């Protein structure tokens, strides 16, 4: 399906055979470089927007985009080989197009658009990844020698946050099922705090699921603007508010039934993480919950499941961009304890775990 | 498996379900960026050589390599997540180490070392891949409009040729099995021409398989130097020779029983490809064979098999580096016909296909004469 090596043709177990087999497997990993390069170049050239507007043969698309015809065929067939675009082959030749699901992912301004991820890679991640050895040499450390938090800046998040909206629906449906099995129902009011809310999608999907709930997102000015616009598109604006500014300044509020941290703790240092956890505990209502949605692994750091394997890789993505980590269950439990909280649930999602915690006293 | 997404937790019915599912699959493809970055950084830092010398925990490796302890933990655990390095468990914890098979791939100077591929990526391919958009805009067409061959240069091949040695053994095993099944044997004299031989591994492995054969490798002088050294390493130097120079000149000799083109045609334009095929036919014994080993796909260009999917991607790798293609079976058949050859076999290998061609047996359906000549010139 995805394989680039016909492994059925790598046979034997002599030392030579095993070395050759490993070399092919390592080469296949190395050529994983090619997929973001192809996809991100296609984005830069306007390929996806053009295919959505009108399906096209490769020569026609090259003319429309002022590109070389042969190179465009090569690029389009590579995108088809990655299952990113569709292609019809009949007696008239080839026509390239987007499926509805691909359109949602590849065009700007849709709910699940990956354009912000493409742009994050182009502008931030790809130059950093080429310098990874330097950061490993020197450490993700500040001028005083202390661990630094992750370095992705608010202006970079303006793109990236929309590009990670796709994570939210599986996470929110898993969380919502558990909250309903926890006696939290529709028709009862509750207040949510979404710390570092990004576009606000996690909050906004909760608002759709729980029609009497309200939610408040904390994020920086320009991100809060994005989040309010998205709430309006989703029809939950009357129950979604933002509180713009650096969340380290406080002004979070109190009485929250749910405090959500999605994709926040991996940005922290241990010192900043424990502070955030204590802040969260202080704003909880009686019977409130903290939900951490993150790349979380056991201290053994064994890649036993896809979520564990992704967490170990995500830690490298954090180091690449200046700090943070994929923290361990044991670390979260330490932070919970320090904040007077106790972990009560762990739920798996496609690429994350949800940890739920509540006040012990 | 080695998936990075737990796809059992993604639904796929509604339009929103399916968009979310595709976005996770596309994201998984995008984060393929991270693996070469981690592996190539580890090479630059000396990780693989150090682990081969002495297995160590992250903190010990950080000390030995003058790196930060936490960042080294992050790097090594990522390599472990990619199955590139292993663990050995002690009563007090574990160390990282390389398996025997991984050592052969990750250390410099071994026969199957990927180091030359790491360095090709670092020096050439990484920066090119981020400029891919501008190369698609302009194409490989020269100032006069004609397509250019691939632009990877001799200085680049000094690293890359050793870094692709790993492809050769499965290919040579498959080729040799077909040669023997067809009647060839190693206790009779035969001559092989290896055009653009690189390190010479393909013809050197053939020389080990067929102990009375000889082989001549064609390449530029700095690569021929590598090939002669490797022939000595493999014990076949008495039957392996090189001829340095631009192989597009032709005049390759006479009487060759086998003319091998491994990883050559994808570098070509259609014009240079047909010229090479004609040079091959001109040097072939009456019963000789041409073997093309390349990224080859049907004209339907459908990603049905791994080899098809890799070929379509490899075409992009050629465009990335200035020219060439993953050519189709039908294009090779054009070139065989233009050279008086006929395809007789197609064989699959892990990431390639082998085409075998012999001298044609039947004449063109168009009789000799001016009309045939005019068709030829057009
Ligand atoms: N000190 C700080 N104050 C406010 N927002 C912050 C912050 N540090 C990080 N953030 C915000 O935290 C978010 C991290 S990305 C995650 C966004 C969202 N929770 C999601 O999972 O999709 C960004 O929107 C970023 O601007
Ligand atoms: N015009 C030319 N004349 C001579 N050698 C050339 C050439 N163009 C390319 N080459 C050589 O062709 C090789 C291409 S890489 C393939 C090497 C080998 N056949 C293998 O498959 O491993 C390089 O060694 C390069 O130096």
Coordinates of N, CA and C in Angstrom, one line a residue, chain B residues 36-224:
Chain B
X36 N 15.4 11.2 7.9 CA 16.7 11.5 7.4 C 17.4 12.6 8.3
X37 N 16.6 13.6 8.8 CA 17.2 14.6 9.6 C 17.9 14.0 10.9
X38 N 17.2 13.1 11.5 CA 17.7 12.4 12.7 C 18.9 11.5 12.4
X39 N 18.7 10.7 11.3 CA 19.8 9.8 11.0 C 21.1 10.5 10.5
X40 N 20.9 11.5 9.7 CA 22.0 12.3 9.2 C 22.7 13.2 10.2
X41 N 21.9 13.8 11.1 CA 22.5 14.4 12.3 C 23.3 13.4 13.1
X42 N 22.8 12.3 13.4 CA 23.5 11.3 14.2 C 24.8 10.9 13.5
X43 N 24.8 10.7 12.1 CA 26.0 10.5 11.4 C 27.0 11.7 11.6
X44 N 26.6 12.9 11.5 CA 27.5 14.0 11.6 C 28.1 14.1 13.0
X45 N 27.4 13.7 14.0 CA 27.8 13.7 15.4 C 28.7 12.6 15.8
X46 N 28.8 11.5 14.9 CA 29.6 10.4 15.2 C 28.9 9.3 16.0
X47 N 27.6 9.3 16.1 CA 26.8 8.4 16.9 C 27.1 7.0 16.5
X48 N 27.0 6.6 15.2 CA 27.0 5.2 14.9 C 28.4 4.6 15.1
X49 N 29.5 5.3 14.7 CA 30.8 4.9 15.0 C 31.0 4.7 16.5
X50 N 30.5 5.6 17.3 CA 30.7 5.5 18.7 C 30.0 4.3 19.3
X51 N 28.7 4.1 18.9 CA 28.0 2.9 19.4 C 28.7 1.6 19.0
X52 N 29.2 1.6 17.8 CA 29.9 0.3 17.4 C 31.1 0.1 18.2
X53 N 31.8 1.1 18.6 CA 33.0 1.0 19.4 C 32.7 0.5 20.8
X54 N 31.7 1.1 21.4 CA 31.3 0.7 22.8 C 29.8 1.1 23.0
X55 N 28.9 0.1 23.1 CA 27.6 0.4 23.5 C 27.5 1.3 24.7
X56 N 26.5 2.2 24.8 CA 26.5 3.2 25.9 C 25.1 3.6 26.1
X57 N 24.8 4.1 27.3 CA 23.6 4.9 27.5 C 23.7 6.3 26.9
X58 N 22.6 7.0 26.9 CA 22.6 8.3 26.3 C 23.6 9.3 27.0
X59 N 23.7 9.2 28.3 CA 24.6 10.1 29.0 C 26.0 9.9 28.7
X60 N 26.4 8.6 28.6 CA 27.8 8.2 28.2 C 28.1 8.6 26.8
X61 N 27.1 8.4 25.9 CA 27.4 8.7 24.5 C 27.5 10.3 24.4
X62 N 26.7 11.0 25.1 CA 26.8 12.5 25.1 C 28.2 12.9 25.6
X63 N 28.7 12.3 26.7 CA 30.0 12.6 27.1 C 31.1 12.4 26.1
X64 N 31.0 11.2 25.5 CA 32.0 10.8 24.5 C 32.0 11.7 23.2
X65 N 30.8 12.2 22.9 CA 30.6 13.0 21.6 C 30.5 14.5 21.9
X66 N 30.7 14.9 23.1 CA 30.7 16.3 23.5 C 29.3 17.0 23.1
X67 N 28.3 16.3 23.5 CA 26.9 16.8 23.3 C 26.2 16.9 24.6
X68 N 25.0 17.6 24.5 CA 24.1 17.7 25.7 C 23.4 16.4 26.0
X69 N 23.3 16.0 27.3 CA 22.8 14.7 27.7 C 21.3 14.6 27.3
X70 N 20.5 15.6 27.6 CA 19.1 15.4 27.3 C 18.9 15.3 25.8
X71 N 19.5 16.2 25.0 CA 19.3 16.2 23.5 C 19.8 14.9 22.9
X72 N 20.9 14.3 23.5 CA 21.4 13.0 23.0 C 20.4 11.9 23.3
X73 N 19.7 12.0 24.5 CA 18.7 11.0 24.8 C 17.6 11.1 23.8
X74 N 17.2 12.4 23.5 CA 16.1 12.6 22.4 C 16.5 12.0 21.1
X75 N 17.7 12.3 20.7 CA 18.2 11.8 19.4 C 18.3 10.2 19.3
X76 N 18.8 9.6 20.4 CA 19.0 8.2 20.4 C 17.6 7.5 20.5
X77 N 16.7 8.0 21.3 CA 15.4 7.4 21.4 C 14.7 7.5 20.1
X78 N 14.9 8.6 19.3 CA 14.3 8.7 18.0 C 14.9 7.7 17.1
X79 N 16.2 7.5 17.1 CA 16.8 6.4 16.3 C 16.2 5.1 16.7
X80 N 16.0 4.8 18.0 CA 15.4 3.6 18.4 C 14.0 3.5 17.9
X81 N 13.2 4.5 17.9 CA 11.8 4.5 17.4 C 11.8 4.2 15.9
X82 N 12.9 4.5 15.2 CA 13.0 4.2 13.7 C 13.6 2.8 13.5
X83 N 13.9 2.0 14.6 CA 14.5 0.7 14.6 C 15.9 0.7 14.0
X84 N 16.6 1.9 14.0 CA 18.0 2.0 13.5 C 19.0 1.5 14.4
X85 N 18.8 1.8 15.7 CA 19.7 1.3 16.8 C 18.9 0.4 17.7
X86 N 19.5 -0.4 18.5 CA 18.9 -1.4 19.4 C 19.3 -1.0 20.9
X87 N 18.7 -1.8 21.8 CA 19.0 -1.8 23.3 C 19.5 -3.2 23.8
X88 N 20.5 -3.1 24.8 CA 20.9 -4.3 25.6 C 20.6 -3.9 27.0
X89 N 19.9 -4.8 27.7 CA 19.5 -4.5 29.1 C 20.4 -5.2 30.1
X90 N 20.8 -4.4 31.1 CA 21.7 -4.7 32.2 C 20.8 -4.8 33.4
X91 N 21.3 -5.2 34.5 CA 20.5 -5.2 35.7 C 20.0 -3.8 36.1
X92 N 20.8 -2.8 35.8 CA 20.6 -1.4 36.2 C 20.0 -0.5 35.1
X93 N 19.7 -1.1 34.0 CA 19.1 -0.3 32.9 C 19.6 -0.9 31.5
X94 N 19.7 0.0 30.6 CA 20.1 -0.4 29.2 C 21.2 0.5 28.6
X95 N 21.8 0.0 27.6 CA 22.7 0.7 26.7 C 22.1 0.6 25.3
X96 N 22.5 1.6 24.5 CA 22.2 1.5 23.1 C 23.4 0.8 22.4
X97 N 23.1 0.1 21.3 CA 24.1 -0.6 20.5 C 23.6 -0.7 19.1
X98 N 24.5 -1.1 18.2 CA 24.1 -1.5 16.8 C 24.1 -3.0 16.7
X99 N 23.0 -3.5 16.0 CA 23.1 -4.8 15.5 C 24.2 -5.0 14.5
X100 N 24.5 -6.3 14.2 CA 25.5 -6.5 13.2 C 25.1 -6.0 11.8
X101 N 23.8 -6.2 11.5 CA 23.3 -5.7 10.2 C 23.3 -4.2 10.1
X102 N 22.9 -3.5 11.2 CA 22.9 -2.1 11.2 C 24.3 -1.5 11.1
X103 N 25.3 -2.2 11.8 CA 26.7 -1.7 11.7 C 27.1 -1.7 10.3
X104 N 26.8 -2.7 9.5 CA 27.3 -2.8 8.1 C 26.7 -1.6 7.3
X105 N 25.5 -1.1 7.7 CA 24.9 0.0 7.0 C 25.3 1.3 7.4
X106 N 25.7 1.5 8.6 CA 25.8 2.8 9.2 C 27.2 3.3 9.4
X107 N 28.2 2.5 9.3 CA 29.6 2.9 9.5 C 30.2 3.2 8.1
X108 N 31.2 4.1 8.1 CA 31.9 4.4 6.9 C 32.8 3.2 6.5
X109 N 32.9 3.1 5.2 CA 33.9 2.2 4.6 C 33.5 0.7 4.5
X110 N 32.4 0.3 5.0 CA 31.9 -1.0 4.8 C 31.3 -1.2 3.4
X111 N 31.2 -2.4 3.0 CA 30.7 -2.6 1.6 C 29.3 -2.0 1.3
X112 N 28.4 -2.1 2.3 CA 27.1 -1.6 2.1 C 26.8 -0.3 2.8
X113 N 27.8 0.4 3.2 CA 27.6 1.6 4.0 C 26.7 2.6 3.3
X114 N 25.8 3.1 4.0 CA 24.9 4.2 3.6 C 25.5 5.6 3.8
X115 N 26.7 5.7 4.3 CA 27.3 7.0 4.6 C 27.4 7.9 3.4
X116 N 27.7 7.3 2.2 CA 27.7 8.1 1.0 C 26.3 8.7 0.6
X117 N 25.3 8.0 1.0 CA 23.9 8.5 0.8 C 23.6 9.5 1.8
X118 N 24.0 9.4 3.1 CA 23.9 10.4 4.1 C 24.5 11.7 3.6
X119 N 25.8 11.6 3.1 CA 26.5 12.8 2.6 C 25.9 13.4 1.4
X120 N 25.5 12.6 0.5 CA 24.8 13.1 -0.7 C 23.5 13.9 -0.3
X121 N 22.8 13.4 0.7 CA 21.6 14.1 1.2 C 22.1 15.5 1.7
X122 N 23.1 15.4 2.7 CA 23.5 16.6 3.4 C 24.0 17.7 2.4
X123 N 24.8 17.2 1.4 CA 25.6 18.2 0.6 C 24.8 18.6 -0.7
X124 N 23.9 17.7 -1.2 CA 23.2 17.9 -2.5 C 21.7 17.9 -2.4
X125 N 21.2 16.8 -1.9 CA 19.7 16.5 -2.1 C 18.9 17.4 -1.1
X126 N 19.3 17.6 0.2 CA 18.5 18.4 1.1 C 18.3 19.7 0.5
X127 N 19.3 20.5 0.2 CA 19.1 21.9 -0.3 C 18.3 21.8 -1.6
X128 N 18.5 20.9 -2.5 CA 17.8 20.8 -3.8 C 16.3 20.6 -3.5
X129 N 15.9 19.7 -2.6 CA 14.5 19.3 -2.4 C 13.8 20.6 -1.9
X130 N 14.4 21.5 -1.2 CA 13.6 22.7 -0.8 C 13.4 23.7 -1.9
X131 N 14.2 23.6 -3.0 CA 14.0 24.4 -4.2 C 13.2 23.7 -5.2
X132 N 12.6 22.6 -4.9 CA 11.9 21.8 -5.9 C 10.9 22.7 -6.7
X133 N 10.2 23.6 -6.1 CA 9.2 24.4 -6.8 C 9.8 25.2 -7.9
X134 N 11.0 25.8 -7.7 CA 11.6 26.6 -8.8 C 12.1 25.7 -9.9
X135 N 12.5 24.5 -9.6 CA 12.9 23.6 -10.7 C 11.7 23.1 -11.5
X136 N 10.6 22.9 -10.8 CA 9.4 22.5 -11.6 C 8.9 23.6 -12.5
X137 N 9.0 24.9 -12.0 CA 8.6 26.0 -12.8 C 9.4 26.1 -14.1
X138 N 10.7 25.9 -14.0 CA 11.6 26.1 -15.1 C 11.9 24.8 -16.0
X139 N 11.9 23.6 -15.4 CA 12.1 22.4 -16.1 C 13.6 22.2 -16.2
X140 N 13.9 21.0 -16.8 CA 15.3 20.6 -17.2 C 15.7 21.1 -18.6
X141 N 14.9 21.9 -19.3 CA 15.2 22.3 -20.7 C 16.3 23.4 -20.6
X142 N 17.4 23.2 -21.5 CA 18.5 24.1 -21.6 C 18.0 25.5 -22.1
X143 N 18.9 26.4 -22.4 CA 18.6 27.7 -22.9 C 17.9 27.6 -24.3
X144 N 18.4 26.6 -25.1 CA 17.8 26.3 -26.4 C 16.6 25.4 -26.4
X145 N 16.1 25.1 -25.2 CA 14.8 24.4 -25.0 C 15.0 22.9 -24.9
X146 N 16.2 22.3 -25.2 CA 16.4 20.9 -25.1 C 16.6 20.4 -23.7
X147 N 16.0 19.2 -23.4 CA 16.1 18.6 -22.1 C 17.6 18.3 -21.8
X148 N 17.9 18.4 -20.5 CA 19.3 18.1 -20.0 C 19.3 16.7 -19.3
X149 N 20.4 16.0 -19.3 CA 20.5 14.8 -18.5 C 20.6 15.3 -17.0
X150 N 20.5 14.3 -16.2 CA 20.6 14.5 -14.7 C 21.9 15.3 -14.4
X151 N 21.8 16.1 -13.4 CA 22.9 17.0 -13.0 C 23.8 16.5 -11.8
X152 N 23.5 15.4 -11.2 CA 24.5 14.9 -10.2 C 25.8 14.8 -10.8
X153 N 26.9 15.3 -10.2 CA 28.2 15.5 -10.8 C 29.2 14.4 -10.3
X154 N 30.3 14.3 -11.0 CA 31.3 13.3 -10.6 C 31.7 13.5 -9.1
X155 N 31.9 14.7 -8.6 CA 32.3 15.0 -7.2 C 31.2 14.5 -6.3
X156 N 30.0 14.6 -6.7 CA 28.9 14.1 -5.9 C 28.9 12.5 -5.9
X157 N 29.1 11.9 -7.1 CA 29.2 10.5 -7.2 C 30.3 9.9 -6.4
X158 N 31.4 10.6 -6.1 CA 32.4 10.1 -5.2 C 31.9 9.6 -3.9
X159 N 30.8 10.3 -3.3 CA 30.1 9.8 -2.1 C 29.0 8.8 -2.5
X160 N 28.1 9.2 -3.5 CA 26.9 8.5 -3.7 C 27.1 7.1 -4.1
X161 N 28.1 6.8 -5.0 CA 28.2 5.4 -5.6 C 28.4 4.3 -4.5
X162 N 29.2 4.6 -3.5 CA 29.3 3.6 -2.4 C 28.0 3.5 -1.6
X163 N 27.3 4.6 -1.5 CA 26.0 4.6 -0.7 C 24.9 3.9 -1.4
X164 N 25.0 3.4 -2.6 CA 24.0 2.7 -3.3 C 24.5 1.2 -3.6
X165 N 25.6 0.8 -3.0 CA 26.0 -0.6 -3.2 C 25.0 -1.6 -2.7
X166 N 24.2 -1.2 -1.7 CA 23.2 -2.1 -1.1 C 22.2 -2.6 -2.0
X167 N 21.9 -1.9 -3.1 CA 21.0 -2.3 -4.1 C 21.5 -3.6 -4.8
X168 N 22.8 -3.7 -5.0 CA 23.3 -4.7 -5.9 C 23.1 -6.1 -5.6
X169 N 23.2 -6.7 -4.4 CA 23.2 -8.1 -4.3 C 21.9 -8.8 -4.7
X170 N 20.7 -8.2 -4.4 CA 19.5 -8.9 -4.8 C 19.4 -8.9 -6.3
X171 N 19.8 -7.8 -6.9 CA 19.7 -7.6 -8.4 C 20.6 -8.6 -9.1
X172 N 21.9 -8.7 -8.6 CA 22.8 -9.7 -9.2 C 22.3 -11.1 -9.0
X173 N 21.8 -11.4 -7.8 CA 21.3 -12.8 -7.6 C 20.2 -13.1 -8.6
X174 N 19.3 -12.2 -8.8 CA 18.2 -12.4 -9.8 C 18.7 -12.4 -11.2
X175 N 19.6 -11.6 -11.6 CA 20.1 -11.6 -12.9 C 20.9 -12.9 -13.2
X176 N 21.7 -13.3 -12.2 CA 22.5 -14.5 -12.4 C 21.7 -15.7 -12.5
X177 N 20.6 -15.8 -11.7 CA 19.7 -17.0 -11.8 C 19.1 -17.0 -13.2
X178 N 18.7 -15.9 -13.8 CA 18.2 -15.9 -15.2 C 19.2 -16.3 -16.2
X179 N 20.4 -15.7 -16.0 CA 21.5 -16.1 -17.0 C 21.8 -17.6 -17.0
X180 N 21.9 -18.2 -15.8 CA 22.1 -19.6 -15.7 C 21.0 -20.4 -16.3
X181 N 19.7 -20.0 -16.0 CA 18.6 -20.7 -16.5 C 18.5 -20.6 -18.0
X182 N 19.1 -19.6 -18.6 CA 19.1 -19.4 -20.1 C 20.3 -20.1 -20.7
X183 N 21.2 -20.7 -20.0 CA 22.3 -21.4 -20.6 C 23.7 -20.9 -20.3
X184 N 23.9 -19.8 -19.6 CA 25.2 -19.2 -19.4 C 25.9 -20.0 -18.2
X185 N 27.2 -20.0 -18.2 CA 27.9 -20.7 -17.2 C 29.3 -20.1 -17.0
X186 N 29.8 -20.2 -15.7 CA 31.0 -19.6 -15.3 C 32.2 -20.3 -15.6
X187 N 32.2 -21.5 -16.1 CA 33.4 -22.3 -16.5 C 33.7 -22.2 -18.0
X188 N 33.1 -21.2 -18.7 CA 33.4 -20.8 -20.0 C 33.7 -19.3 -20.0
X189 N 34.6 -18.8 -20.9 CA 34.9 -17.4 -20.9 C 33.8 -16.6 -21.4
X190 N 33.6 -15.5 -20.8 CA 32.6 -14.5 -21.3 C 33.1 -13.1 -20.8
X191 N 32.6 -12.1 -21.5 CA 33.0 -10.7 -21.1 C 31.8 -9.9 -20.9
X192 N 31.9 -9.1 -19.8 CA 30.9 -8.2 -19.3 C 31.3 -6.8 -19.5
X193 N 30.5 -5.9 -20.0 CA 30.7 -4.4 -20.0 C 29.8 -3.8 -19.0
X194 N 30.3 -3.1 -18.0 CA 29.4 -2.4 -17.0 C 29.6 -0.9 -17.2
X195 N 28.5 -0.4 -17.8 CA 28.6 1.0 -18.3 C 28.2 2.0 -17.2
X196 N 29.0 2.9 -16.8 CA 28.8 3.7 -15.6 C 28.8 2.8 -14.3
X197 N 29.9 2.1 -14.2 CA 30.0 1.0 -13.2 C 29.9 1.5 -11.7
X198 N 30.2 2.7 -11.4 CA 30.2 3.2 -10.0 C 31.3 2.4 -9.3
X199 N 31.0 1.9 -8.2 CA 32.0 1.1 -7.4 C 32.3 -0.2 -8.1
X200 N 31.6 -0.6 -9.2 CA 31.8 -1.9 -9.8 C 31.2 -3.1 -9.2
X201 N 30.4 -2.9 -8.1 CA 29.9 -4.0 -7.4 C 29.1 -5.0 -8.2
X202 N 28.3 -4.5 -9.2 CA 27.4 -5.4 -9.9 C 28.3 -6.4 -10.7
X203 N 29.3 -5.8 -11.5 CA 30.1 -6.7 -12.2 C 31.1 -7.5 -11.4
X204 N 31.5 -7.0 -10.2 CA 32.3 -7.8 -9.3 C 31.6 -8.9 -8.7
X205 N 30.3 -8.7 -8.3 CA 29.5 -9.9 -7.9 C 29.3 -10.9 -9.0
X206 N 29.1 -10.4 -10.2 CA 29.0 -11.3 -11.3 C 30.3 -12.1 -11.5
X207 N 31.4 -11.5 -11.3 CA 32.7 -12.2 -11.4 C 32.9 -13.2 -10.4
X208 N 32.4 -13.0 -9.1 CA 32.4 -14.0 -8.1 C 31.5 -15.2 -8.5
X209 N 30.3 -14.9 -9.1 CA 29.4 -15.9 -9.4 C 29.9 -16.8 -10.6
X210 N 30.6 -16.2 -11.5 CA 31.0 -16.8 -12.8 C 32.5 -16.7 -12.9
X211 N 33.3 -17.7 -12.3 CA 34.7 -17.5 -12.1 C 35.6 -17.4 -13.3
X212 N 35.1 -17.7 -14.6 CA 36.0 -17.5 -15.7 C 35.6 -16.2 -16.5
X213 N 34.6 -15.5 -16.1 CA 34.2 -14.3 -16.8 C 35.2 -13.2 -16.5
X214 N 35.2 -12.2 -17.4 CA 35.9 -10.9 -17.1 C 34.9 -9.8 -17.3
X215 N 35.3 -8.6 -16.7 CA 34.4 -7.5 -16.8 C 35.3 -6.2 -17.0
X216 N 34.7 -5.3 -17.8 CA 35.3 -4.0 -18.0 C 34.2 -3.0 -17.5
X217 N 34.6 -2.1 -16.6 CA 33.8 -1.0 -16.1 C 34.2 0.3 -16.8
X218 N 33.1 1.0 -17.3 CA 33.3 2.3 -17.8 C 32.8 3.4 -16.8
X219 N 33.7 4.4 -16.5 CA 33.2 5.4 -15.6 C 34.2 6.5 -15.8
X220 N 34.0 7.6 -15.1 CA 35.0 8.7 -15.0 C 36.2 8.3 -14.1
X221 N 37.3 8.9 -14.3 CA 38.6 8.4 -13.6 C 38.4 8.4 -12.1
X222 N 37.8 9.4 -11.5 CA 37.8 9.4 -10.0 C 36.9 8.3 -9.5
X223 N 35.9 7.8 -10.2 CA 35.1 6.7 -9.8 C 35.7 5.4 -10.2
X224 N 36.4 5.3 -11.3 CA 37.1 4.1 -11.7 C 38.1 3.7 -10.6

